[PDB]
Amino acid sequence: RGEYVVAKLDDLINWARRSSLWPMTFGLACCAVEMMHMAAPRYDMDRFGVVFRASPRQSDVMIVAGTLTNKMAPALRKVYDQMPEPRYVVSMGSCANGGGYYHYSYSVVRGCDRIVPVDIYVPGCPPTAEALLYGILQLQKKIKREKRLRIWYRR
Amino acid sequence: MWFEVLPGIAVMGVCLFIPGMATARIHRFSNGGKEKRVAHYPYQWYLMERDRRVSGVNRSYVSKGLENID
Amino acid sequence: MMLYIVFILSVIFVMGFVGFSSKPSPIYGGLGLIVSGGVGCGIVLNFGGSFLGLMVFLIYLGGMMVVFGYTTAMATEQYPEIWLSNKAVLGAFVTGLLMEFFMVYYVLKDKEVEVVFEFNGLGDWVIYDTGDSGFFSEEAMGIAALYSYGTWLVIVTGWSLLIGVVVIMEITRG
Amino acid sequence: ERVAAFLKNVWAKEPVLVASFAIAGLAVILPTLSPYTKYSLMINRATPYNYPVPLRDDGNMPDVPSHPQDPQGPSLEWLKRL
Amino acid sequence: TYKYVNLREPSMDMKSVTDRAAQTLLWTELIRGLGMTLSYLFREPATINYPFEKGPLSPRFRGEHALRRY
Amino acid sequence: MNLMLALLTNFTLATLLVIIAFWLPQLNVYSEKTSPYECGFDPMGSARLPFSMKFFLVAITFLLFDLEIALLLPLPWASQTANLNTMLTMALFLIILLAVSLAYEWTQKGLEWTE
Amino acid sequence: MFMINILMLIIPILLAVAFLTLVERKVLGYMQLRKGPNVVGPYGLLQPIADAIKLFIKEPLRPATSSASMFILAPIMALGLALTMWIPLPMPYPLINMNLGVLFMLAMSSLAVYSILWSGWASNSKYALIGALRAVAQTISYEVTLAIILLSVLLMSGSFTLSTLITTQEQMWLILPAWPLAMMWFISTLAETNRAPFDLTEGESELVSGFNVEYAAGPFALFFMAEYANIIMMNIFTAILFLGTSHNPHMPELYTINFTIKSLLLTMSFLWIRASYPRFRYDQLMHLLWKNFLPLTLALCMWHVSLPILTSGIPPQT
Ligand SMILES: CCCCCCCCCCCCCCCCCC(=O)OC[C@H](COP(=O)([O-])OCC[N+](C)(C)C)OC(=O)CCCCCCCCCCCCCCCCC
Numbered sequence: 001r002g003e004y005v006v007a008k009l010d011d012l013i014n015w016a017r018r019s020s021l022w023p024m025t026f027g028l029a030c031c032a033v034e035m036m037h038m039a040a041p042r043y044d045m046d047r048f049g050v051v052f053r054a055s056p057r058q059s060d061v062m063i064v065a066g067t068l069t070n071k072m073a074p075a076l077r078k079v080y081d082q083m084p085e086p087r088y089v090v091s092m093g094s095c096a097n098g099g100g101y102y103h104y105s106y107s108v109v110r111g112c113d114r115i116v117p118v119d120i121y122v123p124g125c126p127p128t129a130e131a132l133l134y135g136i137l138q139l140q141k142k143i144k145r146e147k148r149l150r151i152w153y154r155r
Numbered sequence: 156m157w158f159e160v161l162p163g164i165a166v167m168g169v170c171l172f173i174p175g176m177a178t179a180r181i182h183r184f185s186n187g188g189k190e191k192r193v194a195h196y197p198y199q200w201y202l203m204e205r206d207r208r209v210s211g212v213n214r215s216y217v218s219k220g221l222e223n224i225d
Numbered sequence: 226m227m228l229y230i231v232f233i234l235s236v237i238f239v240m241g242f243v244g245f246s247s248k249p250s251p252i253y254g255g256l257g258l259i260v261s262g263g264v265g266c267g268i269v270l271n272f273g274g275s276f277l278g279l280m281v282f283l284i285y286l287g288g289m290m291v292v293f294g295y296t297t298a299m300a301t302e303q304y305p306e307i308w309l310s311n312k313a314v315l316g317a318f319v320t321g322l323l324m325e326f327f328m329v330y331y332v333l334k335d336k337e338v339e340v341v342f343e344f345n346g347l348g349d350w351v352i353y354d355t356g357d358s359g360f361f362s363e364e365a366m367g368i369a370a371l372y373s374y375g376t377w378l379v380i381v382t383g384w385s386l387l388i389g390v391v392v393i394m395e396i397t398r399g
Numbered sequence: 400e401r402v403a404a405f406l407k408n409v410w411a412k413e414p415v416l417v418a419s420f421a422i423a424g425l426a427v428i429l430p431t432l433s434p435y436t437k438y439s440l441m442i443n444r445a446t447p448y449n450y451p452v453p454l455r456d457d458g459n460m461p462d463v464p465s466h467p468q469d470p471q472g473p474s475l476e477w478l479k480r481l
Numbered sequence: 482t483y484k485y486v487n488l489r490e491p492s493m494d495m496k497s498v499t500d501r502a503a504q505t506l507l508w509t510e511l512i513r514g515l516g517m518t519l520s521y522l523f524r525e526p527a528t529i530n531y532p533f534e535k536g537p538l539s540p541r542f543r544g545e546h547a548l549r550r551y
Numbered sequence: 552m553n554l555m556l557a558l559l560t561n562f563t564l565a566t567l568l569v570i571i572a573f574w575l576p577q578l579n580v581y582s583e584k585t586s587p588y589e590c591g592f593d594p595m596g597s598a599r600l601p602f603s604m605k606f607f608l609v610a611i612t613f614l615l616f617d618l619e620i621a622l623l624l625p626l627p628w629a630s631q632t633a634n635l636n637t638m639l640t641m642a643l644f645l646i647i648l649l650a651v652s653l654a655y656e657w658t659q660k661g662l663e664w665t666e
Numbered sequence: 667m668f669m670i671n672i673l674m675l676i677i678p679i680l681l682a683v684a685f686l687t688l689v690e691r692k693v694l695g696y697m698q699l700r701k702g703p704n705v706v707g708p709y710g711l712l713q714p715i716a717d718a719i720k721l722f723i724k725e726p727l728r729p730a731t732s733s734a735s736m737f738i739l740a741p742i743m744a745l746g747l748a749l750t751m752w753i754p755l756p757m758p759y760p761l762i763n764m765n766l767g768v769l770f771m772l773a774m775s776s777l778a779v780y781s782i783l784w785s786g787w788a789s790n791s792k793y794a795l796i797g798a799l800r801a802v803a804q805t806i807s808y809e810v811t812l813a814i815i816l817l818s819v820l821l822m823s824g825s826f827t828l829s830t831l832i833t834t835q836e837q838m839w840l841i842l843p844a845w846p847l848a849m850m851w852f853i854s855t856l857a858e859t860n861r862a863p864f865d866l867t868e869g870e871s872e873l874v875s876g877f878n879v880e881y882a883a884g885p886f887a888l889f890f891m892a893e894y895a896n897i898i899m900m901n902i903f904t905a906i907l908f909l910g911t912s913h914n915p916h917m918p919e920l921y922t923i924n925f926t927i928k929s930l931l932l933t934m935s936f937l938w939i940r941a942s943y944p945r946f947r948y949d950q951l952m953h954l955l956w957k958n959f960l961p962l963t964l965a966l967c968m969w970h971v972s973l974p975i976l977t978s979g980i981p982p983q984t
Pocket residue numbers: 009012013148149151152155568570571574575576577718719722723
């Protein structure tokens with residue numbers, strides 16, 4: 001049966017991608033400090049297979065951890081475009097989510113989703129390190145639900 | 156705990172043990188149960204080539220003893 | 226086909242020479258010299274000189290590493306030239322390959338060839354020695370003799386290398 | 400006195416170079432003082448890489464042996480005891 | 482009041498000079514640093530097993546909003 | 552043969568891994584994705600512009616020193632000579648001249664990088 | 667039967683490399699008061715498999731400005747040469763028994779540098795170029811001292827054959843009569859393998875990713891597999907050189923176990939060192955080798971030429 005095979009192959013690639021999520025070493029403001037605390041020993045994001053890598057060419061996730069200003073917006077879009085696919089964006093904190101405390105500023109982008117597509121929105125100012133980890137595990141369960149091969153089979 | 160690092164080390168150790176064990180056993184299988192003949196110098200190659208002719212079966216590792224001298 | 230191993234490697238030897246002799250960007254010229262140095266090591270090794278072959282390869286790998294560094298510093302342009310990018314480079318490159326290909330084609334066809342001078346194409350093995358059975362490498366004995374017979378060679382080479390350091394310091398002290 | 404004053408200074412500032420020169424000096428010096436150096440050349444001579452071509456016995460070579468196990472010819476008793 | 486963090490003169494007696502030569506050549510202070518990371522290898526890690534375990538919080542924690550009733 | 556077979560197998564294994572890497576994944580190529588990386592902003596000037604080498608003199612000295620080891624690597628074989636008086640003298644002579652050349656370049660500030 | 671032997675060498679190499687990545691992350695983790703991968707498979711045992719599958723289904727990118735052929739060639743050279751380094755290794759029997767195995771390993775190590783130089787240059791990006799030129803400096807720093815360190819050791823072994831080192835060390839490890847050289851050799855292998863504190867050609871905190879910054883997915887994986895294969899191979903080389911395992915011809919597997927344990931611990935030491943020290947500055951690496959190791963290495967080379975002659979203990983040529 002073709003369906004059974006592509007169903008199992010979807011599980012394999014979905015498992016491999018969520019089990020090995022490499023965020024780009026990309027932080028913007030206060031929220032990056034809680035992101036640092038997710039890598040710290042108490043939460044040890046490495047133990048889920050989550051490893052920071054500096055190069056966008058070697059990153060699977062962009063965690064927008066902090067305010068995105070207008071001056072920074074073209075750079076964030078640049079490094080997002082330079083990530084190979086599949087790629088995911090996690091929006092962390094009120095600033096990234098929708099402008100937050102600086103929503104009405106002349107120099108702030110009112111939400112990073114004006115610039116890049118966003119898979120998960122982590123609320124808080126900042127979200128606790130555990131709240132960000134909950135957001136990453138939520139991203140994993142989203143990847144687990146993907147049906148690329150199943151949809152390809154029925155094209 | 157630190158001993159939870161051991162399982163990955165053991166897997167790494169078994170994988171690194173395989174090439175040495177495999178090479179040693181394939182040499183015995185391919186050389187009639189003995190070590191592969193080592194010929195670093197022309198003299199050693201000469202004798203090995205002479206053993207190939209002497210074997211009568213074109214194998215330098217098939218040995219002939221007293222039973223071959225009448 | 227394996228009996229023609231030295232010939233095949235020597236064909237690649239020339240191809241590497243045509244590579245850097247057509248003079249593309251020195252980055253690619255260095256690549257062509259590495260290939261030639263690699264197969265050149267293979268040619269000499271097949272004549273019984275394992276130490277000579279590996280040594281020339283080792284030296285030329287170190288030399289081309291320096292050339293690479295100097296190239297990015299002192300011999301680079303905005304658009305470094307590959308063999309296809311330049312008409313003069315391509316013409317020399319093609320001319321070299323065609324001269325090479327025709328020498329190969331005719332030497333194989335006739336088992337001989339006249340390219341200015343006469344070369345026999347029976348295969349290179351025919352000239353080899355037929356009786357070896359010593360307990361040593363003759364190349365290793367000859368090279369090691371540099372320290373017992375080559376006292377004079379040791380002195381002039383050692384002195385030249387020391388003077389070489391003194392000289393390059395002088396030459397590059399503006 | 401200056402022998403120790405200079406040496407102490409380099410020991411404090413560049414012990415790596417002090418060790419280098421001391422080791423190099425021993426390499427140059429000890430071979431001429433060692434009583435075992437003479438055996439290095441004897442062992443190299445006693446190593447038979449070549450066949451020992453026999454001599455045509457012409458009737459007056461008392462110092463040469465007729466058989467490998469004859470008392471004449473060099474011996475390696477010194478080598479077994481080394 | 483103030484203190485100096487780095488204003489000390491090394492002693493020049495032969496024992497101290499040799500102690501420093503051994504440090505420079507035998508890498509004693511680099512070996513010492515290896516000891517510290519080794520001690521950490523055998524310490525229990527501080528990691529909690531999220532989501533089965535949770536970081537501690539207090540009654541004042543400010544999280545998701547809610548409207549209450551009588 | 553064994554040697555050529557081993558080299559061919561290794562470099563063929565590497566080539567197959569690259570072939571799979573390029574033909575198996577789904578691709579989506581556009582200009583911004585393939586643009587050169589420089590931390591989010593476009594590069595200023597070509598990466599082919601000259602890159603000054605501050606250790607150029609050590610690099611040339613490496614060539615001379617790298618040939619010395621070609622002269623020294625035969626020493627294990629040279630030690631089997633019967634003429635050990637000459638061999639030991641010439642071996643030490645060569646290494647000392649290497650040390651003298653190093654000491655000269657050191658004292659003349661050849662090992663300091665240009666600033 | 668030789669083709670089977672080749673596969674029984676390189677399939678295990680790549681599997682050992684994959685699980686060395688897991689071991690490093692766990693060892694670093696516990697040294698850092700955390701755990702490291704323990705979710706993907708029991709004790710993280712499936713984590714290397716997940717990463718490998720992830721990368722090879724990731725989209726590979728050819729940069730717009732890159733030199734296409736050289737961009738592809740470099741990772742192929744890196745892994746190909748890394749696997750070639752293993753063929754003369756006696757464990758206890760080499761796959762290929764070479765008269766000049768040590769010289770072969772030196773030559774192949776030099777050739778592997780060009781996979782760094784060409785990948786960085788072919789990327790046509792500034793961080794990649796800076797990384798590649800750091801590899802030029804690194805090679806200039808260690809290569810001369812590395813060869814002369816080996817020479818001094820081989821003056822006791824008597825040959826360039828790797829299997830002779832087993833015979834040389836049948837009574838005693840060479841680490842005893844040559845621990846100063848072992849010290850300098852061990853550091854040189856860290857520089858040779860681009861390992862911390864000499865991780866300069868990648869230098870993440872400085873160059874983002876250095877020579878491989880433009881590489882993604884499978885092509886990037888080839889560079890990772892190459893480096894980690896070289897780390898294991900260089901510690902096997904260190905074990906053979908200095909910690910010779912006794913070889914019983916009738917029980918060759920006892921040699922393999924003892925030798926494998928030694929090589930593992932030496933590899934663990936590389937990870938341990940990475941956890942402990944800050945990074946060198948790449949000009950300070952060059953001064954370390956030329957101003958400290960080289961003067962000492964030259965002196966010790968003189969000593970190890972003279973010592974066999976003066977003690978009448980020159981090894982056999984054969
Ligand atoms: C050490 C080496 C490690 C190697 C690891 C190897 C990975 C092992 C696991 C393989 C899982 C199966 C592959 C699935 C991943 C495919 C990537 C993907 O997600 O594409 C989604 C795409 C989705 O396409 P789509 O049609 O649904 O939509 C994409 C188009 N737009 C953008 C418009 C929507 O799937 C496919 O297109 C085809 C899926 C086929 C799955 C079977 C793969 C066959 C392999 C042959 C490929 C031909 C080239 C030869 C390569 C060598 C063969 C081995």
